[PDB]
Design a binder for these strands. Structure first.
Ligand SMILES: [Ca+2]
Ligand SMILES: [Ca+2]
Ligand SMILES: [Ca+2]
Length: 255
DNA sequence: GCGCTGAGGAGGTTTCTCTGTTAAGCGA
DNA sequence: CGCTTAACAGAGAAACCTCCTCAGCGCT
C-alpha cells in the first residue's frame, strides 16, 4: 500500500492509452491527464476512477463509434494525487518527457498561455533495455501496459482448414528500446518488426513463447482489469482446444 | 465586477491492435 | 510430407492530442 502495486498497473495503462496534455484556452491553459477508450471499457474507466479518487467521466459518439473518457484537469487533484504516482512509478517509454515537461509547468504555476515554452518530445531514448527489466515495479507496470497495447488473438490459417494459431502481440511508436525490453523480459526470439511509420512490432506464436505469456499473466502481482481480462480468458480457453499448446502449458480457468 | 477556473463539448489525427498470408523451419 | 513457426504487413477503429465557450466562484 501507499502506492500499492496496482498504482504501477495504472501508469502502464496510461502510458499506452493515456496522454498528459497541456492545452490552450485563450489567455489560459488547461492541464489534462486523460484516457479515452472504446465504450467496451465503460466498466474499467469507473474502475480507474474508483482507484484514483479523481477525474470526470464522459461519453462521446463520433459517427458509428461510442467512446468514453476519464479526464483529470483540476490542478489541485493533479498535484496531490496524480504526480506522486508518476513520480513514484515513472513511465518507461519516451512519454516520460511528456510527464516531465507537464509536471514542471504545472509546478511552476504556469497559468498564462503565452508563458508556456514550446515543447516537443526528445527522440532520444531516456532509458536502457537493462534499466527496464531491472525495474522493480516493472512486473506490475507490464500488466498495465498490456491492458492498453497488448493483443491476445487466435485465428485460423488456412481460411479453408481447422488449423488454429494462438498469438500475443504488442507495439510502440518510437519504442524500439521498450519493445526490446519486453521482448527480452519474456525470452522471445522472434524479429521485432519495424514498420513504415517507425512502429516497432512484437509478435510471438510458438508454444514456448505462449507458454511464457500465459506464465507471466499468471505469476504477475496484479491482474488485468478491463476488456483485456475477458480477452485473455477467452484466449486461454481457446488455447485449450489447439493441441500444441494444450499439451505443454498449465491452462487454469480461475483468472 | 474581474480573473481565473473545471466541466463540458468537440475537431484533427494516427498508433495501434487484431487477424492474417506467404513462404520457410523442422521432426521425422 | 505435414505439423509448426517466422517474417511481413493492411487497414481502419480505438486511441491520442488539442482548442473553445461557459457558469460559477473567490478575490478585492
Ligand atoms: Ca496505445
Ligand atoms: Ca500509446
Ligand atoms: Ca488499446
Amino acid at each position: 500500500s501507499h502506492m500499492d502495486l496496482t498504482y504501477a498497473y495504472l501508469v502502464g495503462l496510461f502510458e499506452g492509452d493515456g496522454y498528459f496534455s497541456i492545452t490552450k484556452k485563450g489567455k489560459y491553459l488547461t492541464y489534462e491527464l486523460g484516457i479515452e477508450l472504446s465504450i467496451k471499457d465503460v466498466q474499467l474507466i469507473y474502475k480507474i476512477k474508483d482507484i484514483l479518487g479523481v477525474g470526470k467521466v464522459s461519453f462521446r459518439k463520433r459517427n458509428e463509434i461510442e467512446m468514453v473518457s476519464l479526464r483529470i484537469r483540476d490542478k489541485n487533484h493533479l498535484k496531490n494525487f496524480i504526480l506522486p504516482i508518476f513520480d513514484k512509478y515513472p513511465m518507461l517509454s519516451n512519454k516520460q518527457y511528456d510527464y516531465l515537461r507537464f509536471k514542471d509547468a504545472l509546478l511552476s504555476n504556469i497559468i498564462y498561455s503565452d508563458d508556456l515554452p514550446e515543447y516537443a518530445r526528445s527522440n532520444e531514448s531516456i532509458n536502457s533495455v537493462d534499466s527496464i527489466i531491472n525495474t522493480s515495479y516493472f512486473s506490475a507496470w507490464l500488466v498495465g501496459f498490456i491492458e492498453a497495447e497488448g493483443c491476445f488473438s487466435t485465428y485460423k490459417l488456412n481460411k479453408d482448414d481447422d488449423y488454429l494459431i494462438a498469438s500475443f502481440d504488442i507495439a510502440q511508436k518510437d519504442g524500439d528500446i521498450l519493445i526490446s525490453a519486453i521482448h527480452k523480459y519474456l525470452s522471445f526470439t522472434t524479429k521485432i518488426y519495424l514498420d513504415k511509420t517507425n512502429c516497432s512490432r512484437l509478435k510471438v506464436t510458438g508454444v514456448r513463447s505462449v507458454k511464457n505469456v500465459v506464465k507471466f499473466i499468471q505469476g504477475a502481482p496484479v491482474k488485468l482489469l478491463g476488456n483485456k481480462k475477458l480477452q485473455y480468458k477467452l484466449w486461454i480457453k481457446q488455447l485449450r482446444k489447439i493441441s500444441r499448446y494444450s499439451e505443454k502449458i498449465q491452462l487454469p480457468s480461475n483468472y
